[PDB]
Every structure is written in structure tokens, then in C-alpha cells.
């Protein structure tokens, strides 16, 4: 129902669990809203496709469910969907400043320009890509700008 | 009628399947990531 | 990478740390080589592998 | 009727195991036997953990 | 030749079989070629035409 | 990527081994992972950092 | 007339440090005081290594 258990087909070393343990209270997208889920559909890596359309990723992401990352313990993830209304905490890696008063939206991430391409999780070919959490005026600005485009 | 009172219990070590096992109780699996055993062998 | 859980958990040595500038002024102006600042109560020290 | 182990294998970490666990994120079981056989020079243990 | 050497004797266990008052030691040589490199010469490749 | 110096240097408990097949076949066909199959004697275990 | 140290202060490796040096490629200075102060629950060492 609420607490959603994910797994891993591959083992995590100390480096992998170390970079996972700094991802607590990060929002990840889940497409299914089911309980015993698997890590390949976790995140946007199954849905990311360059030269396919940013607006497609945008529509599927705003159609996707959202959940919060807390308490890995070794081959376990414990995703927890946030309930509607109650206060939660978030931790964003998207290089955009925030504000105590504004609102947020969730957008597929852009490249900032340094081009790091390392979101601190990779399992073989599979990688983790995190959706950018963007303050509301920048969100409607990029929406209207792609609409003018 | 009466309750289903005829329930019984089973243990691990009473079963012979523990002959395939080496049961070890250790209270920190949640703080454990992997468990490795590494073997060295010279050949004749 | 330096595991700051090892600093947050091991018993340390009591020192009257005295330097002339402010702590944050020495921090953000990068007098040192590696920092680790959390403004709340970071629970990253509590999980051990 | 055969014999059977009456209880589980109660296995616990040493204090220096805990210090290595918090410091370098690793556990080497029966640390004192390793240290004593290393200092003595005997390269073969009687048993493992 | 039999005068030369073979002074003392020691007992050791093996297995024998009796065939027409002739006892003969049965033996296998897996322990000498267990994790070795050379092929066991009792394993043979015969060829018919 | 495991510390093979920690395997070669530390005292090791001896066993009667039993691989089902030959052990070099098991190494060349990957029954396990991270198989250090150096021939001769590599002195790289000596230097300690 | 000032009182200076007559010689260099010697630093010695603990036998517990040797296993961390071989296995984990690291040295924690004065390992046994860390282990004892961790086991006793005392949070501050009375002196530095």
C-alpha cells in the first residue's frame, strides 16, 4: 500500500551503498503504484530516450507516480509514497536554488553545462536518472518556452 | 461450532533440513552488506 | 572519499579550537581542503556497513 | 535417532571488529586470532569463525 | 637385489580382492591426479577403424 | 578487485579441498568471480601502502 | 634555560594496526585506546596519540 519495497539483481559494494545513503528523501518516479517492484523500472532510465521528445518525457513523468527514497539497508530500498497533505522533506540534486515560499513542479532534467552525467548510481548498463525538482516560475517558463518553440 | 483449536507447531532444528544448513544467529544483518569467503589454493 | 561517519562516531580528543576568523568565514572562503557541513541533524552517521 | 544441534550458532563481533566496521566499513571475523597468529608467525589457523 | 635394502616394514591400510587363492591389491589413482596438470595415463584414447 | 595481498599475507585456515571438476577448468570457466590465476610467483604482495 | 625534549618521540605501530594495514590499506593511530574508549562509552579521549 504505502511502503513500497524494491530490490536489486546486482550486489552493491560499499561505494554503491555509500552513494545511495546520501540519496535519502529524494523523489523518484514509479510508473506502477505496486508493492513488490523491481529496479529496472525504477527511475527514468527505462523511459529516457534522446532524440525522442522532451515533451513525451514530460507527459509520462506528470503521469508517473512519485515516491520518496528512505532507508536502504543492502539489496533493499524502501520507497514510500508521500501521502497527500502531510509535511515531508525533500533533497534535490538539481542545480537550481529554492525559496521558503514558492511552490514546486517535477520536470525531466536538462543538462546544466558542466555535463557530469553521473547521478551517483550505475549498475552495469543501467543508470539512475533523477527528475529535476523545479520552482514554479521556472517550470511554467520552460513550459511556455517549449510551447513557443 | 467450536474454534479450530487443533493447530500445531513446527521448528527448524527439529526438521532434518537443518542437516543441509549451519544455523548461525547474528544480530546485525541489517548493518551487513555482503559476506565473502576467499580461498587460496596452490596446485600440485 | 573520507567517511564522515567515522568522524561522527569515533571518540575524539577534546581541543579548545581557537582560530581568529569566524568558522563559516573560514569555511565558505575555503581555507581548508575538504568540508562537510549539515545544517540539521544528519542521520547519515547512524547506518554502518 | 541422531544427534542434532540444539540451538543456533550465536556469533558476535569483537570490539576491534566494531572499530574496523565503523572506520573502514569492513569486518574481519575472529580478529584476535588473526592478530596473534600474525605476531607469532604461525600461518595456519585452527578454525574459522 | 633383494639382498640390497628393504630393511624395515610398516603397516598401512588398503583394499584387496581374492581370486583363486591369489590376493591382489585394488587401486585407483585419482588422488595423484586430482588438481594436477598432466593427464592420467590410465585414461586412454583407443581408436577403431 | 579484492585485496589479494590480504589473502596471501594473512594466516589462512587449511582444508581438504574438493572441487568437483579440475580446478583450472573451474577457473577458466568462471564458477566464481575475481579469479587471480598468476603463474610462478608474483612479488607484488610484498610492498605495503 | 628552557627544557626541550632530549630526543625524537618514537612512534610505534600496534599489532592491531598491522592487520588494518595489510587488509584495508590504512592505519588508525592508537587503535587500542579507540577500542577501549568505544567499549566503555567514553566520548572524549584524555590525550592525543
TrEMBL record, chain A:
<protein>
    <submittedName>
        <fullName>Capsid triplex subunit 2</fullName>
    </submittedName>
</protein>
TrEMBL record, chain B:
<protein>
    <submittedName>
        <fullName>Major capsid protein</fullName>
    </submittedName>
</protein>
TrEMBL record, chains C, F:
<protein>
    <submittedName>
        <fullName>Major capsid protein</fullName>
    </submittedName>
</protein>
From TrEMBL, chain E:
<protein>
    <submittedName>
        <fullName>Major capsid protein</fullName>
    </submittedName>
</protein>
